[PDB]
Every structure is written in structure tokens, then in C-alpha cells.
CSV table of N, CA and C in Angstrom, one decimal:
chain,number,residue,atom,x,y,z
A,22,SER,N,-56.0,55.9,-39.0
A,22,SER,CA,-55.4,56.4,-39.1
A,22,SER,C,-53.4,56.3,-39.7
A,23,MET,N,-53.3,57.5,-39.2
A,23,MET,CA,-52.0,57.6,-38.6
A,23,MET,C,-51.0,57.9,-37.6
A,24,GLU,N,-52.1,58.4,-36.8
A,24,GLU,CA,-51.7,59.2,-35.6
A,24,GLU,C,-52.0,57.9,-34.1
A,25,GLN,N,-52.6,57.3,-35.1
A,25,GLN,CA,-53.3,56.3,-33.7
A,25,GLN,C,-52.9,54.7,-34.0
A,26,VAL,N,-51.8,54.9,-35.4
A,26,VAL,CA,-50.5,53.5,-35.1
A,26,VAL,C,-49.2,54.2,-35.1
A,27,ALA,N,-49.3,56.1,-35.0
A,27,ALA,CA,-48.1,55.9,-33.8
A,27,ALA,C,-47.8,56.1,-32.9
A,28,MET,N,-49.2,56.2,-31.8
A,28,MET,CA,-49.9,56.6,-30.9
A,28,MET,C,-49.9,54.5,-30.4
A,29,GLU,N,-49.7,53.9,-30.8
A,29,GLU,CA,-50.0,51.9,-31.2
A,29,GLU,C,-48.0,51.8,-31.1
A,30,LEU,N,-47.2,52.1,-31.7
A,30,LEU,CA,-45.1,52.7,-32.0
A,30,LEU,C,-45.5,52.9,-30.6
A,31,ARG,N,-45.6,53.6,-29.6
A,31,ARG,CA,-45.2,54.7,-28.8
A,31,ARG,C,-45.0,53.4,-27.6
A,32,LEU,N,-46.5,52.7,-27.2
A,32,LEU,CA,-46.6,51.5,-26.5
A,32,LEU,C,-46.4,50.6,-26.4
A,33,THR,N,-45.6,50.1,-28.1
A,33,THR,CA,-45.6,49.4,-28.7
A,33,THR,C,-43.8,49.5,-27.8
A,34,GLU,N,-43.1,50.5,-28.2
A,34,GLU,CA,-41.8,51.1,-27.5
A,34,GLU,C,-42.0,50.5,-26.2
A,35,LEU,N,-42.6,51.1,-25.3
A,35,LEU,CA,-42.9,51.1,-23.7
A,35,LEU,C,-43.4,50.5,-23.4
A,36,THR,N,-43.0,48.8,-24.0
A,36,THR,CA,-43.9,48.0,-23.2
A,36,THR,C,-42.7,47.1,-24.0
A,37,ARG,N,-41.1,47.6,-25.0
A,37,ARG,CA,-40.3,46.4,-25.5
A,37,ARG,C,-39.7,47.6,-24.1
A,38,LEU,N,-39.8,48.7,-23.3
A,38,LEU,CA,-38.5,49.7,-22.5
A,38,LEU,C,-38.9,48.5,-20.7
A,39,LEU,N,-40.4,48.2,-21.2
A,39,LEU,CA,-41.0,47.4,-19.5
A,39,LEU,C,-40.7,46.7,-19.2
A,40,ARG,N,-40.9,45.4,-21.1
A,40,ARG,CA,-40.5,44.4,-20.4
A,40,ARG,C,-38.9,44.7,-20.5
A,41,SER,N,-37.6,45.0,-20.9
A,41,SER,CA,-36.2,45.8,-20.2
A,41,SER,C,-35.5,45.2,-18.3
A,42,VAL,N,-37.5,46.3,-18.1
A,42,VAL,CA,-37.6,47.0,-16.8
A,42,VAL,C,-37.9,45.8,-16.2
A,43,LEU,N,-38.5,44.4,-16.1
A,43,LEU,CA,-39.4,43.4,-15.3
A,43,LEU,C,-38.7,42.2,-15.4
A,44,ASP,N,-37.5,42.2,-16.8
A,44,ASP,CA,-36.1,41.1,-16.1
A,44,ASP,C,-35.6,41.9,-15.8
A,45,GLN,N,-35.0,43.3,-14.8
A,45,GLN,CA,-34.2,43.7,-14.1
A,45,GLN,C,-34.4,43.4,-12.9
A,46,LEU,N,-35.9,43.6,-12.4
A,46,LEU,CA,-36.2,43.4,-10.8
A,46,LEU,C,-36.7,42.1,-10.3
A,47,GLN,N,-37.3,41.4,-11.7
A,47,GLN,CA,-37.5,40.0,-11.2
A,47,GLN,C,-35.6,39.1,-11.5
A,48,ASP,N,-34.3,40.0,-11.9
A,48,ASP,CA,-33.6,39.0,-11.2
A,48,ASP,C,-32.8,39.9,-9.9
A,49,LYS,N,-33.6,40.8,-9.4
A,49,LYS,CA,-33.8,41.2,-8.0
A,49,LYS,C,-34.8,40.3,-6.5
A,50,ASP,N,-35.1,38.8,-8.1
A,50,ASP,CA,-35.2,37.9,-6.4
A,50,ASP,C,-35.5,36.5,-7.4
A,51,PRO,N,-34.2,37.0,-6.7
A,51,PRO,CA,-33.6,35.0,-7.5
A,51,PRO,C,-34.4,33.4,-6.2
A,52,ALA,N,-34.3,34.0,-5.3
A,52,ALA,CA,-34.7,32.8,-4.4
A,52,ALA,C,-36.7,32.6,-5.1
A,53,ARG,N,-37.7,33.3,-6.7
A,53,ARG,CA,-38.0,33.1,-7.8
A,53,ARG,C,-39.5,32.8,-6.2
A,54,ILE,N,-39.5,33.6,-4.8
A,54,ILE,CA,-41.0,34.0,-4.2
A,54,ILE,C,-41.1,34.4,-5.1
A,55,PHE,N,-41.3,35.7,-6.2
A,55,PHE,CA,-42.0,36.3,-6.2
A,55,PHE,C,-42.3,36.1,-7.3
A,56,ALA,N,-42.7,35.5,-7.2
A,56,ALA,CA,-42.8,34.3,-10.1
A,56,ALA,C,-43.7,34.5,-9.5
A,57,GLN,N,-45.2,33.8,-8.9
A,57,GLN,CA,-46.1,33.2,-9.8
A,57,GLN,C,-46.5,33.5,-8.1
A,58,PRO,N,-48.4,32.7,-8.3
A,58,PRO,CA,-49.6,33.7,-7.7
A,58,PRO,C,-49.4,33.2,-7.1
A,59,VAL,N,-49.3,34.2,-5.3
A,59,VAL,CA,-49.6,32.9,-3.9
A,59,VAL,C,-50.7,31.5,-4.6
A,60,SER,N,-51.0,30.1,-3.7
A,60,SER,CA,-51.1,29.6,-4.3
A,60,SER,C,-52.5,29.5,-3.4
A,61,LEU,N,-54.1,29.9,-3.7
A,61,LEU,CA,-55.2,29.6,-3.2
A,61,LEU,C,-55.3,27.9,-1.9
A,62,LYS,N,-54.9,26.8,-3.4
A,62,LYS,CA,-54.7,26.0,-2.5
A,62,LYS,C,-53.7,25.4,-1.3
A,63,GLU,N,-52.8,25.9,-1.5
A,63,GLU,CA,-52.1,26.5,-0.1
A,63,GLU,C,-52.0,27.8,1.1
A,64,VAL,N,-52.7,28.7,0.6
A,64,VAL,CA,-53.0,29.5,1.6
A,64,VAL,C,-54.2,30.0,1.2
A,65,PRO,N,-55.1,28.8,2.0
A,65,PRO,CA,-56.4,29.1,1.4
A,65,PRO,C,-57.2,30.4,1.8
A,66,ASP,N,-56.4,31.3,2.6
A,66,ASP,CA,-57.5,32.1,3.3
A,66,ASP,C,-57.0,33.6,2.4
A,67,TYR,N,-55.4,34.1,1.7
A,67,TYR,CA,-55.3,34.6,1.4
A,67,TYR,C,-56.0,36.1,0.3
A,68,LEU,N,-57.2,35.5,-0.1
A,68,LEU,CA,-57.5,36.5,0.0
A,68,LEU,C,-58.9,37.7,1.0
A,69,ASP,N,-58.6,36.7,2.5
A,69,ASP,CA,-58.8,37.2,3.0
A,69,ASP,C,-58.7,38.3,3.5
A,70,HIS,N,-57.4,38.1,3.2
A,70,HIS,CA,-56.1,38.7,3.8
A,70,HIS,C,-55.8,40.4,2.3
A,71,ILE,N,-55.7,40.1,1.7
A,71,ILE,CA,-55.2,40.4,0.5
A,71,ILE,C,-56.1,41.0,-0.4
A,72,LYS,N,-56.0,41.9,-0.7
A,72,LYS,CA,-57.6,41.9,-1.7
A,72,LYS,C,-57.1,42.5,-3.2
A,73,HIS,N,-56.4,42.9,-3.5
A,73,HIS,CA,-55.4,42.9,-5.5
A,73,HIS,C,-53.5,41.1,-4.9
A,74,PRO,N,-53.9,41.0,-5.0
A,74,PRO,CA,-53.2,39.8,-5.1
A,74,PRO,C,-52.5,40.2,-5.9
A,75,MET,N,-50.6,39.7,-6.8
A,75,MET,CA,-50.2,40.5,-8.2
A,75,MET,C,-48.6,39.4,-7.4
A,76,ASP,N,-48.0,39.4,-8.5
A,76,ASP,CA,-47.1,39.0,-8.9
A,76,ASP,C,-45.8,39.0,-10.2
A,77,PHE,N,-45.1,38.7,-10.4
A,77,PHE,CA,-44.3,38.7,-11.5
A,77,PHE,C,-45.3,37.7,-13.0
A,78,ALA,N,-45.3,36.7,-13.1
A,78,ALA,CA,-45.5,36.0,-14.0
A,78,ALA,C,-47.0,36.5,-14.5
A,79,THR,N,-48.2,37.0,-13.4
A,79,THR,CA,-49.3,38.5,-13.7
A,79,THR,C,-48.4,39.2,-13.9
A,80,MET,N,-47.7,40.1,-13.4
A,80,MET,CA,-47.1,40.6,-14.2
A,80,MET,C,-47.4,41.3,-16.4
A,81,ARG,N,-46.1,40.0,-16.0
A,81,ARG,CA,-45.4,39.7,-17.3
A,81,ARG,C,-46.3,39.2,-18.6
A,82,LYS,N,-48.3,39.0,-18.1
A,82,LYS,CA,-49.7,38.2,-19.0
A,82,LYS,C,-49.7,39.7,-19.3
A,83,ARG,N,-49.5,40.9,-18.5
A,83,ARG,CA,-50.1,41.9,-19.2
A,83,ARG,C,-49.4,42.8,-19.9
A,84,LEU,N,-48.7,43.0,-18.9
A,84,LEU,CA,-47.2,44.0,-20.4
A,84,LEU,C,-47.4,42.8,-21.4
A,85,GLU,N,-47.1,42.0,-22.1
A,85,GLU,CA,-47.5,41.0,-23.5
A,85,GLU,C,-48.1,41.3,-24.9
A,86,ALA,N,-49.7,41.8,-23.1
A,86,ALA,CA,-50.8,41.9,-24.0
A,86,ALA,C,-50.6,44.2,-24.2
A,87,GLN,N,-49.2,44.6,-24.2
A,87,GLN,CA,-50.0,46.0,-24.3
A,87,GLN,C,-51.0,46.6,-23.0
A,88,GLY,N,-50.6,46.3,-22.1
A,88,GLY,CA,-52.2,46.1,-21.1
A,88,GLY,C,-51.4,47.7,-20.0
A,89,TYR,N,-50.3,48.2,-19.9
A,89,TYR,CA,-49.3,48.8,-18.8
A,89,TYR,C,-49.2,50.6,-20.4
A,90,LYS,N,-50.5,51.1,-20.0
A,90,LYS,CA,-51.0,52.8,-20.8
A,90,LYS,C,-49.1,53.4,-20.3
A,91,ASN,N,-48.7,53.1,-19.4
A,91,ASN,CA,-47.7,54.6,-19.0
A,91,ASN,C,-46.9,53.4,-17.4
A,92,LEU,N,-45.1,54.0,-17.1
A,92,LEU,CA,-44.3,53.5,-16.0
A,92,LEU,C,-45.7,53.6,-14.5
A,93,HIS,N,-46.4,54.2,-14.5
A,93,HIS,CA,-47.3,54.7,-13.3
A,93,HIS,C,-47.8,53.4,-13.0
A,94,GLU,N,-48.4,53.2,-13.8
A,94,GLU,CA,-49.1,52.1,-13.6
A,94,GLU,C,-48.4,50.8,-13.3
A,95,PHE,N,-47.6,50.7,-14.1
A,95,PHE,CA,-46.9,49.1,-14.2
A,95,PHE,C,-45.7,49.2,-12.0
A,96,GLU,N,-45.1,50.6,-11.8
A,96,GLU,CA,-45.3,51.0,-10.6
A,96,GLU,C,-46.0,50.2,-9.8
A,97,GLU,N,-47.1,50.7,-9.6
A,97,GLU,CA,-48.3,50.5,-8.7
A,97,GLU,C,-48.2,48.8,-8.3
A,98,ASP,N,-48.2,47.9,-10.1
A,98,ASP,CA,-48.7,47.0,-9.9
A,98,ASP,C,-47.0,46.3,-8.7
A,99,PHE,N,-46.2,46.5,-9.3
A,99,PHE,CA,-44.8,46.3,-8.8
A,99,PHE,C,-45.1,46.5,-7.2
A,100,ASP,N,-44.9,47.5,-6.8
A,100,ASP,CA,-45.0,48.3,-5.7
A,100,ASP,C,-46.6,46.4,-4.3
A,101,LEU,N,-47.4,46.8,-5.3
A,101,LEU,CA,-48.1,45.1,-4.3
A,101,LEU,C,-47.9,43.8,-4.5
A,102,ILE,N,-46.4,43.7,-5.0
A,102,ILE,CA,-46.0,42.5,-4.9
A,102,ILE,C,-45.4,42.5,-3.9
A,103,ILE,N,-44.5,43.4,-3.6
A,103,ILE,CA,-43.3,43.8,-2.0
A,103,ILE,C,-44.9,43.9,-0.7
A,104,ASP,N,-45.6,45.3,-1.3
A,104,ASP,CA,-46.3,45.7,-0.3
A,104,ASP,C,-47.5,43.9,0.1
A,105,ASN,N,-48.6,44.0,-0.7
A,105,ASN,CA,-49.1,41.9,-0.5
A,105,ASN,C,-48.0,41.6,1.3
A,106,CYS,N,-47.0,40.7,0.3
A,106,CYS,CA,-45.1,40.2,0.5
A,106,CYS,C,-45.9,40.5,2.7
A,107,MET,N,-45.2,42.0,2.7
A,107,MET,CA,-44.7,42.7,4.1
A,107,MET,C,-46.5,42.8,4.4
A,108,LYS,N,-47.5,43.1,4.1
A,108,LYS,CA,-48.7,42.8,5.3
A,108,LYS,C,-49.4,41.3,5.8
A,109,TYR,N,-48.9,40.3,4.5
A,109,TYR,CA,-49.1,38.8,4.8
A,109,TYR,C,-48.6,38.1,6.1
A,110,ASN,N,-46.5,38.3,5.5
A,110,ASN,CA,-45.4,38.1,6.9
A,110,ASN,C,-45.0,38.4,7.9
A,111,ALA,N,-44.2,37.9,8.6
A,111,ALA,CA,-43.9,39.0,9.2
A,111,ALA,C,-42.8,38.7,9.6
A,112,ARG,N,-42.4,40.8,9.7
A,112,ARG,CA,-40.4,40.7,9.5
A,112,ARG,C,-39.7,40.2,9.5
A,113,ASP,N,-39.9,38.6,10.4
A,113,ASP,CA,-38.6,37.7,10.6
A,113,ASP,C,-38.8,36.2,9.4
A,114,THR,N,-39.3,36.8,8.9
A,114,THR,CA,-39.6,35.8,7.7
A,114,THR,C,-38.9,36.0,6.2
A,115,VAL,N,-38.0,34.2,6.1
A,115,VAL,CA,-37.6,34.7,4.7
A,115,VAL,C,-38.3,36.0,4.1
A,116,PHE,N,-40.4,35.8,3.7
A,116,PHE,CA,-40.0,36.4,2.5
A,116,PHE,C,-40.7,37.7,2.8
A,117,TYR,N,-41.0,37.9,4.0
A,117,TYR,CA,-41.4,39.7,4.0
A,117,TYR,C,-39.9,40.7,3.9
A,118,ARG,N,-38.8,39.5,4.6
A,118,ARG,CA,-37.4,40.0,3.7
A,118,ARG,C,-36.7,40.5,2.8
A,119,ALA,N,-37.4,39.2,1.8
A,119,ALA,CA,-37.1,39.6,0.5
A,119,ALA,C,-37.9,40.3,0.3
A,120,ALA,N,-38.5,40.1,0.6
A,120,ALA,CA,-39.2,42.2,0.2
A,120,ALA,C,-38.8,43.4,0.1
A,121,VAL,N,-38.9,43.5,1.1
A,121,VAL,CA,-37.8,44.7,1.0
A,121,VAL,C,-35.9,44.4,0.1
A,122,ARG,N,-35.3,43.2,0.3
A,122,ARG,CA,-34.9,43.3,-0.4
A,122,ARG,C,-34.4,43.4,-1.6
A,123,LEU,N,-35.9,43.3,-2.5
A,123,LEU,CA,-36.6,43.5,-3.8
A,123,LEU,C,-36.6,44.9,-4.3
A,124,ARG,N,-37.7,45.8,-2.9
A,124,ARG,CA,-37.9,47.2,-3.6
A,124,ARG,C,-36.3,47.6,-3.3
A,125,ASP,N,-35.7,47.4,-2.7
A,125,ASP,CA,-34.4,48.2,-2.2
A,125,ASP,C,-33.6,48.5,-4.0
A,126,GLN,N,-33.4,46.8,-4.7
A,126,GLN,CA,-32.1,46.5,-6.1
A,126,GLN,C,-33.7,47.2,-6.9
A,127,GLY,N,-35.3,46.8,-6.6
A,127,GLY,CA,-35.9,47.6,-8.0
A,127,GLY,C,-36.1,48.8,-7.3
A,128,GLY,N,-35.9,50.0,-6.6
A,128,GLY,CA,-35.5,51.8,-6.6
A,128,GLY,C,-34.8,52.0,-7.4
A,129,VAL,N,-34.1,51.8,-6.9
A,129,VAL,CA,-32.1,51.9,-8.6
A,129,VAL,C,-32.4,52.1,-10.0
A,130,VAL,N,-33.7,50.0,-10.6
A,130,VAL,CA,-34.0,50.2,-11.5
A,130,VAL,C,-35.3,51.7,-12.2
A,131,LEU,N,-36.1,51.2,-10.8
A,131,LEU,CA,-37.5,51.9,-11.8
A,131,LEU,C,-36.2,53.8,-11.5
A,132,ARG,N,-35.1,54.1,-10.4
A,132,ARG,CA,-35.0,55.5,-10.5
A,132,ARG,C,-34.6,55.7,-12.7
A,133,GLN,N,-33.8,54.7,-12.8
A,133,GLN,CA,-33.5,55.6,-14.1
A,133,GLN,C,-34.4,55.0,-15.7
A,134,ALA,N,-35.7,54.0,-15.1
A,134,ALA,CA,-36.7,53.8,-16.3
A,134,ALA,C,-37.3,55.5,-15.7
A,135,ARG,N,-37.8,55.9,-15.0
A,135,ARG,CA,-38.5,57.2,-15.1
A,135,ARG,C,-37.4,58.1,-15.6
A,136,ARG,N,-35.9,58.5,-15.9
A,136,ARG,CA,-35.7,59.2,-16.4
A,136,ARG,C,-35.7,58.8,-18.3
A,137,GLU,N,-35.9,57.5,-18.1
A,137,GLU,CA,-36.2,57.1,-19.0
A,137,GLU,C,-37.0,57.2,-20.3
A,138,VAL,N,-38.3,57.1,-19.4
A,138,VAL,CA,-39.7,57.7,-19.6
A,138,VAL,C,-40.3,58.6,-20.4
A,139,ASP,N,-39.4,59.9,-19.1
A,139,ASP,CA,-39.5,60.9,-19.6
A,139,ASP,C,-38.3,61.8,-20.7
A,140,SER,N,-37.3,61.2,-20.8
A,140,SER,CA,-35.9,61.5,-21.4
A,140,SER,C,-36.8,60.7,-23.2
A,141,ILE,N,-36.8,59.8,-23.4
A,141,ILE,CA,-37.1,59.6,-25.3
A,141,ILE,C,-39.1,59.7,-25.1
A,142,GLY,N,-39.5,59.8,-23.7
A,142,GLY,CA,-40.5,60.9,-23.8
A,142,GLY,C,-41.9,59.6,-24.5
């Protein structure tokens, strides 16, 4: 149908905007702490602690499959990155501190992305 195509074009455009958002958030992680999944070889007990692991590579795979239907789903995954790190790692660690900085810097980006999503529709 033509409606299905129009909906597919909307999803494609949302994907384009989320790619730009993802790039901007990932630049706020210049140490690449959140770039890849936590290694179960190196942290064998990780899944005893963290039930839904997340990282930027995993988000990018989902994004490129057009697997985010709306900005709320994308934000949920971003928040997992932060929130998982702040639970597993103590306050005095470079990891926890990196997460706090990512959260604070990413908030700005996400605030305008929400306005852009509502605005463009």
C-alpha cells in the first residue's frame, strides 16, 4: 500500500535523525568506555549483576536494522548504558565518572532531539 510506504519513509527519516543523535552522544565518550559490550571473558560475573547489558555498538546494530520505532525506545537503551555502569562500578571509578559525564552531556543532545521529533513529526 501507499500508506505502508509512507510509514516506512517516516521510520527511515527517524532512523536518519537517531543516527545523528547517536553520533553526537558517542562523541561525549571520547575514552570509548561505552563503545562495545562489556566482555564476559574479562568480567565473567557481569550478568549476575546486570540483567540488560547495553553499549553503543549494540545500539548502532539496532538502529541500522530500523529497530527503533520512536525516540523513547532509543532513550531507553541510552539510559541502560549509563544506569548499568553506575550500578556495577563504584562512585570513585573512572567508569562511573564517565557515565555521569555522558549522562550530563547527552541530556542537552536529547533535549533538542525530542523537540525535533515532535516538530518534524
